[PDB]
Amino acid sequence: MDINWRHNQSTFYHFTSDHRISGWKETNAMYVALNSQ
Amino acid sequence: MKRTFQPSVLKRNRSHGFRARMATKNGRQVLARRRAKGRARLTVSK
Amino acid sequence: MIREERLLKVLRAPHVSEKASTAMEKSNTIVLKVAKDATKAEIKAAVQKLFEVEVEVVNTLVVKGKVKRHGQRIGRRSDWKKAYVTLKEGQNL
Amino acid sequence: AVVKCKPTSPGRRHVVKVVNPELHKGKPFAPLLEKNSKSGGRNNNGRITTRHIGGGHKQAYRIVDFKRNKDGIPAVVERLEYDPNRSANIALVLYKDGERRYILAPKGLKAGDQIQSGVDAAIKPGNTLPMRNIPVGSTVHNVEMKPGKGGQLARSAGTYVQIVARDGAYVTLRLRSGEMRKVEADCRATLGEVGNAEHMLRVLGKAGAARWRGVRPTVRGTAMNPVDHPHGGGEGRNFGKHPVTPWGVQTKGKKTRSNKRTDKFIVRRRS
RNA sequence: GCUCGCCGGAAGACCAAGGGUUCCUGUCCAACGUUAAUCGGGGCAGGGUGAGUCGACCCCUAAGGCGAGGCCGAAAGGCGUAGUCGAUGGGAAACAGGUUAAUAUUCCUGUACUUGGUGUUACUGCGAAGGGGGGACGGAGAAGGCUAUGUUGGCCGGGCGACGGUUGUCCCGGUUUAAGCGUGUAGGCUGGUUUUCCAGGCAAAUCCGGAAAAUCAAGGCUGAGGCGUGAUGACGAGGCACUACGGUGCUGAAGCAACAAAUGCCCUGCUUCCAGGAAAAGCCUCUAAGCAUCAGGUAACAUCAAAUCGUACCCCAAACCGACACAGGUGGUCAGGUAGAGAAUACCAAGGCGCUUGAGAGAACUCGGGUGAAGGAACUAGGCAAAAUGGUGCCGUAACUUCGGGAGAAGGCACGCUGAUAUGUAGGUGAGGUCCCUCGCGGAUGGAGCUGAAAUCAGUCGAAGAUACCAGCUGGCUGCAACUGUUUAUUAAAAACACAGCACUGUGCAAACACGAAAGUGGACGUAUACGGUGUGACGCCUGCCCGGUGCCGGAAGGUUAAU
RNA sequence: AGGACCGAACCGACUAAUGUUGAAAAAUUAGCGGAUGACUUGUGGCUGGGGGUGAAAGGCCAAUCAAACCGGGAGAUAGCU
């Protein structure tokens, strides 16, 4: 359980996805930034 | 959805197996580092 | 011919179970654990010459070892080989 | 015979076929066939060296006799056949000693027709003979460039070469290019012109026809990004550059012959 | 255990890949199981995988890998000849029934087949990393002959029935049988046989190829299925005797015919079309060197051998890939009934499941749905969403057009059930009988029986007959793109990319060009009617002027101009 | 006959709604496009990082791409926090 918890905390450490906050969290930040311009 | 690891034993061995690490200079250096690090399984054979 | 020094090392134990038992009491076959590298000619010759009976035919399977564990330490047992030795009409053991 | 297809279903609207009722409907002659594996445009390094190649139909190679070595033995043309490896058709011929061979089919040549290779051959279309024995001003195909080597000039369909001069040990040849070239006069050549001229009149009609001759699509350079082709980029259509190959060498004019070894043999370049 | 619901071209069954004991039995409930658990793919122990014929190994090869020498390269190393590996392909042979808690084309019963070794006997020219054949192989389409399978009748066994009727044009069930061996059919292909001669198959050849004759008109090859045997056997609905009520033994009737019919088989066929459709071995043949009263070949018989590894279990999934017992992904094989064109869809059979939290209540609100007065786009960025349309036959159908289309334009009418025509027709199939015989798996006649649309007329029911499920909304003007396609895996499917077609330009073959310190390889076993690059992008009418700038091509006089 | 027409398997992904600490690190449901072809799919092989491949989007190259991943130079450098 401890090994699975360390690896499953280590899941989104090297991500790329920009529309999702922290790799996973859905948001509207594309529209927020885009409307700020 | 179709994930990346679609397993096949024959491609596992032809690709990353022992006779294929020993077949060249750099794979032999791979085996040398795995033995020197001291590793329970060197290649992926079975 | 097969040398007798080879031919003694092949048979290892009689196999006791209920499939073995019904094979003896129903179809003349004695079931026995053999050497892992033992061929059917060696098992046939070794039952011909070590229990002095007449063997009709041998059928050999290989049984795979079970991954047990002690505490939190695993381990596979060990593969063995099992020979179904079909005798002729005149036999005892 | 060229035939416009009737325009049922687009795709057939613009097709022109070149049908030939005198070609053999059936299997080719087997012991002159061999395996011809398709490459994909890719060398022994795996890399695409010639682009736009790949796919298409499976083809078997046909050993065509370009040398024409059986001298003095006559041969009757057994039949004409479709060859997938060429523009022209091939004639299967039967020599008098019982040996069949495929030759390139010249223009007039039908089934049941005598051809004959060698020095003392009659001058009539289909006979391969050395060019010191052919008259000046004769159409001639399947020309050798070195004696004994095999034919390499005028092999593609509807193509001939005219012999214009015999100055010494050399014959001046008007190649189909328009180029005047000197060839050694001991080089064999086959009389007549090679015979499927109407090949150039076909029109293919759709995209998949090109695809089934093994010609993958051609992405044009200006549609790419600047990292890909020198033409690249630009906010809608934007050319602005002198037109080049994908490797920067000028297309549209720039001469790319450098031989210096065979410049002796070129009397006049093409125009 | 009885009911109820769900899947049933799957949510059933069998595998491959992958996993690796999860399989089966006994036992335990700590943790694992999104709850409880006596249960479990969990814990512990024991058991379980049986092969000459299935698969692998093996023989042969494709793509491709590696590669003695070799060519090349500062070194490492690249390429590659001989060779050697490499299946996803080619190559010998087993089927039915029974059995275990758990394996079975493997065990048992019955009946078989294949390939090698050895021995005997009879005849005898055998012999290759060599020659020839063969293996040997496309897309589409069309029927014909069959079968699997199903339906109905006959037969056999059982029932006469909780509620009106049900001894009959009644109800329920069964009606199965293989490989192998023998026969040779519906098809399909090909003229056959004998003699002589030859510049071909590196040599030889009796084989192949070729050229002459002569004669006969048939022979040969291949082939589904049927039929006979296998099989007076097995299986069989059910009864009988004991019954650790789990079953265990014994016995066991009929076991036929008609019709329908595949996407399976004849068929690697046939017809056709361009886009012109693997290789090598096994296999059959020919001989060379050699061996020639020997060895070897062929045939019969006998005898021996056929090793090794896989075999459990899941396999559209709780066991594989997805961190999960995850609403996802995952190749092949089998494919019953009724309605239906159908592998759609509805309801079902075989079979398998009810999705590992439940009990209530019946607020707002959210989600998935049903219906809605009058109105009917007034909503809105925009008819988004929903509603509507929806089948088959027949009538009918405009502009425009590349003469194909548009077109299912548009718009209509008919549709159930019953009866008659006709105790079910037209059609399909086709027995007994009869006739002939080159006599049988034959052809001619004949129509019993079975199957069976579709139409008209008459009648009848309902508000409604394409009644459910399933199943086009239509028309008008216009921009872009000719069209089918492709693309931003994961906010962009588009007018963008592609395209056929056009043009310009390079390229004479050791081609230009590309990958490569090089060797080499692709271009291409191609040769200018070809190949590469660039732009434009079907088709129709067309494509005007400018060479001063930048580029390219050509010129060589003069100026300037490096190493030396 | 057909890069032909309608339409399942099969391939895809146009719209809407849900979901958005999901059942799911891209799906479900209802409609939707192709569906004999430039199709689709299984098994194997080949191409590799300024390199591949690209019907071209800077797309894709193991949930990573205007230059992959791993290890090293390496405690880079950071007048900045």
Cβ atoms D102, D210 nearer than 8 A: no
Domain positions in chain D are: 1-113, 117-194, 195-271
Our measurement of CA B3 to C1' E12, in angstroms, reads 29
Segment holding C46, helix H or strand E: helix C40-50
Cβ atoms D243, D253 nearer than 8 A: no
Cβ atoms C58, C84 nearer than 8 A: yes
The Cα D193–Cα A34 span in angstroms is 70
Our measurement of CA D14 to C1' E35, in angstroms, reads 72
Chains contacting D with at least 3 CB pairs below 8 Å? none
- Amino acid found at C35: A
DSSP letters, D150-217, are: -EEES-STT--EEEEE--TTEEEEE-TTS-EEEEETTSEEEES-BS-GGGGG----SHHHHHTTTB--
Q: Two tokens at D248?
A: 């920067």
| Contact flag, residue A15 CB and nucleic strand F, below 7 A | yes
- Considering the domain delimited by D1-113, tell me its CATH architecture: Beta Barrel (2.40)
Q: Name the phi and psi angles at D88, rounded to 5.
A: -85, 175
DSSP letters, chain D, are: -EEEPP-SSTTSSS-EEE--TTB--S---GGGEEE-----SB-TTS-B-SSSB------EEE-B-SS---BS-EEEEEEEE--TTSSS-EEEEEETTS-EEEEE-BSS--SS-EEEBSTT--SSTT-EEETTSSPTT-EEESEESSTTT-EEES-STT--EEEEE--TTEEEEE-TTS-EEEEETTSEEEES-BS-GGGGG----SHHHHHTTTB-----GGGS-TTTSSS---SSS---S--B-TTSPBPSS------SSSSTTEEE---
Query: Which residue is it, tokens 């035939």?
Result: D3
Q: Strand pairing partners for D161?
A: D140
* Beta carbons within 8 Å of C24's beta carbon, 6+ residues apart: C30, C31
* Beta carbons within 8 Å of D192's beta carbon, 6+ residues apart: D106, D107, D108, D109, D125, D126, D139, D140, D141, D160
Of D144, D138, D137, the residue nearest D185 (C-alpha): D144
Experimentally, how was this structure solved?
cryo-EM
Q: Two tokens at A11?
A: 């899941």
- Name residues 33-72 of chain D with a Cβ under 7 Å from nucleic strand F: 42, 45-48, 51, 55
Q: Nucleotides of chain F within 7 Å of a protein C-beta?
A: 1-4, 20-22, 24-27, 37-39, 43-48, 52-58, 62-67, 70
- Name residues 129-168 of chain D with a Cβ under 7 Å from nucleic strand E: 145-146, 152-159
Domain positions in chain B are: 1-46
- Considering the domain delimited by D195-271, tell me its CATH architecture: Irregular (4.10)
Cβ atoms D189, D136 nearer than 8 A: no
Q: Longest Cα pair distance anywhere in chain C, in angstroms?
A: 51
Cβ atoms C58, C86 nearer than 8 A: yes
Q: Nucleotides of chain E within 7 Å of a protein C-beta?
A: 17-21, 43-52, 62-66, 76-77, 79-80, 87, 100-102, 106-108, 132-134, 136-137, 198-201, 209-211, 273-279, 305-311, 320-323, 328-330, 402-405, 482-484, 490-491, 496-502, 504-516, 520-539, 550-554
What is B1-46's CATH number, 3.80.10.10, 1.10.287.3980, 3.40.190.10, 1.20.140.10?
Answer: 1.10.287.3980
Considering only CA atoms, name the residue closest to the C1' of nucleotide E21. C66
Query: Which residue is it, tokens 């090297």?
Result: A14
